[PDB]
């Protein structure tokens, strides 16, 4: 009786939450932004092509200076590229070939890499012996790592395939905080501009907004009908966008607690692998399984451009901190910079 | 040539990196990489010890071939999320315990897992090496408790030579892609010295088929 009574109480709370959300909604985003001028066709040409990877490229991250970038591929290689001269600054050989994520520290001193070995390795790029060396091996997870991001040079947050997020301490090497509450394994995370909060999307079709300091889940969003593979904050920090296997993107808001726009098309029936915003927050880059990338405008969900020129799945996608270039990786082992 | 001296030294370093990348990526394409799979209490542990917290990579060599097996057991996450990483392995090695028909039951779970992987969209052409292990005590587990407990449609004799063949044909079904891949099968025992020669012959056949598709005879 107690279990079913708690279940009915939970259902009543969910119903009152739904009623509050429905009472807050008074005018959809598509009704206020029907008067603003639309953007034309976004023609973007390929400027560079970083061709040194042999296997499938699974992750890429831009440096903060907007010139260097790290890429990870399952030939067991972590390559630091110079995007202006196309020069290979570094090539790091990994112990485990099965990687799924890589991060560039906002200082530029460290590179993180994680995969199917349940370990997040931290590599030092600025030693005095000349070569890059593995500094730390954060090993406390029980499922594969799907994302990792530096808060600073000493704190990193990692999402794993065991439904748990974890905030670590590079120096000591232990989990400072453990975020739990997801039921499906988490596939991506995204820090806010100010690093107080961060969202994470899981295979249970939910996106949870955690607070880094208190260690608690603040809000939960459910609008998708399948696994969520990509997530990214709006540049403002008061919204974000998710991309799932149901071939849609969705724009959730944090202060209204409900979604605002859905980016979908009839001709698109493939899942999204990656998503990223522009610098102004107007454009929305979404990489797909149909070998293409698409460019929406968030204020009115009509497709404004297409980035074609990859011969396999677009696995990773990143915008530079200046807003100058867009890097896209793929399973055909080529990175491409667009502008 | 619009490049300073430091820029030229940077380009020289980048190209010296490229040379090592090519050497490594051409040494990698000479190793055979097999993906181990199976259910609980199977023969995966045993076959690893006979041939040689996340993925366990085992390396060994046989007759000028270098194999690396990726035992991905214990990755208790959503398999539909990390299995495309293995699209492009030479062969799968699927272990099934023959004694687990009496102890739905374990054999039906193994058959469901085999049907799940053998028809995956990432393994539409990858060969499968079925290892039906633990036949030594399966030979005596059928003297009592006839096979009808697991398969109610069995009408043959309770002899080992026929029940084992019936199980083998029940497993070599479920292969809806009978034209792109082949299912190799072996009846091994805990004390068996020919378990690596069979996988060698199977991967030799897979290599020969890939070479026939490459040269153009297919």
């Amino acid at each position: 009786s107690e279990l079913d009574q708690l279940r009915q109480e939970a259902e009543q709370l969910k119903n009152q939450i739904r009623d509050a959300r429905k009472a807050c909604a008074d005018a959809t985003l598509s009704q206020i932004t029907n008067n603003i001028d639309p953007v034309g066709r976004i023609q973007m040409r390929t400027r560079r092509t970083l061709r040194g990877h042999l296997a499938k490229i699974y992750a890429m991250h831009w440096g903060t200076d907007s010139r260097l970038l790290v890429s990870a591929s399952q030939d067991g290689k972590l390559i630091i590229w110079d995007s202006y001269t196309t020069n290979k600054v570094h090539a790091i050989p990994l112990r485990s070939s099965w990687v799924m994520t890589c991060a560039y520290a906002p200082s530029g001193n460290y590179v993180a890499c994680g995969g199917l070995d349940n370990i997040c390795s931290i590599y030092n790029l600025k030693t005095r012996e000349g070569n890059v060396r593995v500094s730390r091996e954060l090993a406390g997870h029980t499922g594969y790592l799907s994302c990792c991001r530096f808060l600073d040079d000493n704190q990193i947050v990692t999402s794993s395939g065991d439904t748990t997020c974890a905030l670590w301490d590079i120096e000591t090497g232990q989990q400072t905080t453990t975020f739990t509450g997801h039921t499906g394994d988490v596939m991506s995370l995204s820090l806010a501009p100010d690093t107080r909060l961060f969202v994470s999307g899981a295979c249970d079709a939910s996106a949870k907004l955690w607070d880094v300091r208190e260690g608690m889940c603040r809000q939960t969003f459910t609008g998708h009908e399948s696994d969520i593979n990509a997530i990214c904050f709006f540049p403002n920090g008061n919204a974000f966008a998710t991309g799932s296997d149901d071939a849609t993107c969705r724009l959730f808001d944090l202060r209204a607690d409900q979604e605002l726009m859905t980016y979908s098309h009839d001709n698109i029936i493939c899942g999204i692998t990656s998503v990223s915003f522009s610098k102004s927050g107007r454009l929305l880059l979404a990489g797909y399984d149909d070998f293409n990338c698409n460019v929406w405008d968030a204020l009115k969900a009509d497709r404004a451009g297409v980035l074609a020129g990859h011969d396999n799945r677009v696995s990773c996608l990143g915008v530079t901190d200046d807003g100058m270039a867009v890097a896209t990786g793929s399973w055909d082992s080529f990175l491409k910079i667009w502008n | 040539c619009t490049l300073s001296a430091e820029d030229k030294a940077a380009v020289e370093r980048s190209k010296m990196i490229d040379r090592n990348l090519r050497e490594d990526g051409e040494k990698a394409a000479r190793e055979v990489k097999l993906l181990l799979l199976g259910a609980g209490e199977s023969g995966k542990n045993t076959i690893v010890k006979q041939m040689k917290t996340g993925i366990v990579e085992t390396h060994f060599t046989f007759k000028d071939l270098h194999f690396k097996m990726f035992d991905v057991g214990a990755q208790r996450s959503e398999r539909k999320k990390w299995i495309h990483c293995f699209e492009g392995v030479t062969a799968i090695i699927f272990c099934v315990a023959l004694s687990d028909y009496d102890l739905m039951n374990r054999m039906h779970a193994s058959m469901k897992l085999f049907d799940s992987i053998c028809n995956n969209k990432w393994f539409t052409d990858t060969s499968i090496i079925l290892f039906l292990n633990k036949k030594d005590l399966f030979e005596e587990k059928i003297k009592k408790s006839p096979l009808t407990i697991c398969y109610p449609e069995y009408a043959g004799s309770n002899t080992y030579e026929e029940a084992a063949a019936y199980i083998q044909c029940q497993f070599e079904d479920l292969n809806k892609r009978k034209d792109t891949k082949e299912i190799y099968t072996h009846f091994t025992c805990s004390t068996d010295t020919k378990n690596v020669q069979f996988v060698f012959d199977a991967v030799t056949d897979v290599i020969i088929k890939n070479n026939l598709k490459d040269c153009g005879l297919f």
Partner: single-chain antibody
Framework: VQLVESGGGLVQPGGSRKLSCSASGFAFSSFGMHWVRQAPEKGLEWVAYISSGSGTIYYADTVKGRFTISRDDPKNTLFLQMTSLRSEDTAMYYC??????????????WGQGTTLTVSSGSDIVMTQATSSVPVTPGESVSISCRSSKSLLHSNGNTYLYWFLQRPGQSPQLLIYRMSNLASGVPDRFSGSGSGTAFTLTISRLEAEDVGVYYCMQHLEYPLTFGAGTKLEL
């Protein structure tokens, strides 16, 4: 990280000698090496350079065809074979490592050097309009230099390095481009400049920063240091 040079000694003119330099404690194979020398009482001058993997070699045009620089990667030594030693090739020889990628620090570690004594046009000239500057601790100094042509490349860089040699030791990298402080160097030194005129400002001195401040360009070859500026008292 250390470099130990050996060889040296007394040689008669027209003879030959092989200077060795054993490296220890760093990835020798990924570093290019330079041989630089310093006369008994003069400044620094660049002698030879061998890149990483031995793919590029440069000489100073004062020793070209007479010296041979060669690196051994397995046995970490670096060799300089010298033949037909004239009377101008008498000096202390330093080995200096250098690595070149985007954002690196070339010339970051100088060896100890070995003494060699022998009995009996389009280059860039680095002009340091000073030879000695008297100063007391706590004050701020501004050493200055100027070049023959603009050291500012088209790619935005300005290939000007500021070194420092303390009495009885080897030079030390202070600034590794116009306004780029090296690692391990206190935050008192500050580089600045524009075009062909450059300045090194020290906010407050100490007892461990008096000595000869040199300069160097890396825009073209050969590498030309300026004449030192001595800070005493």
């Amino acid at each position: 990280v250390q470099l130990v040079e050996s060889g040296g000694g007394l040689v008669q003119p027209g003879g030959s000698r092989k200077l060795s330099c054993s490296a220890s404690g760093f990835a020798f194979s990924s570093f290019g090496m330079h041989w630089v020398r310093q006369a008994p009482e003069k400044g620094l001058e660049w002698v030879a350079y061998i890149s990483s993997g031995s793919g590029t070699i440069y000489y100073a045009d004062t020793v070209k065809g007479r010296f041979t620089i060669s690196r051994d990667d397995p046995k970490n030594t670096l060799f300089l074979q010298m033949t037909s030693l004239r009377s101008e090739d008498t000096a202390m020889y330093y080995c200096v490592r250098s690595i070149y990628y985007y954002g690196s620090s070339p010339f970051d570690f100088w060896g100890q050097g070995t003494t060699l004594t022998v009995s009996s046009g389009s280059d860039i000239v680095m002009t340091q309009a000073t030879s000695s500057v008297p100063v007391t601790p706590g004050e701020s100094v501004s050493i200055s230099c100027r070049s023959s042509k603009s050291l500012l490349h088209s790619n935005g860089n300005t290939y000007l390095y500021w070194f420092l040699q303390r009495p009885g030791q080897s030079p030390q990298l202070l600034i590794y481009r116009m306004s780029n402080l090296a690692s391990g160097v206190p935050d008192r030194f500050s580089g600045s400049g524009s075009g062909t005129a450059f300045t090194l400002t020290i906010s407050r001195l100490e007892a461990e920063d008096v000595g000869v401040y040199y300069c160097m360009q890396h825009l073209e070859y050969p590498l030309t240091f300026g004449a030192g500026t001595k800070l005493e008292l």
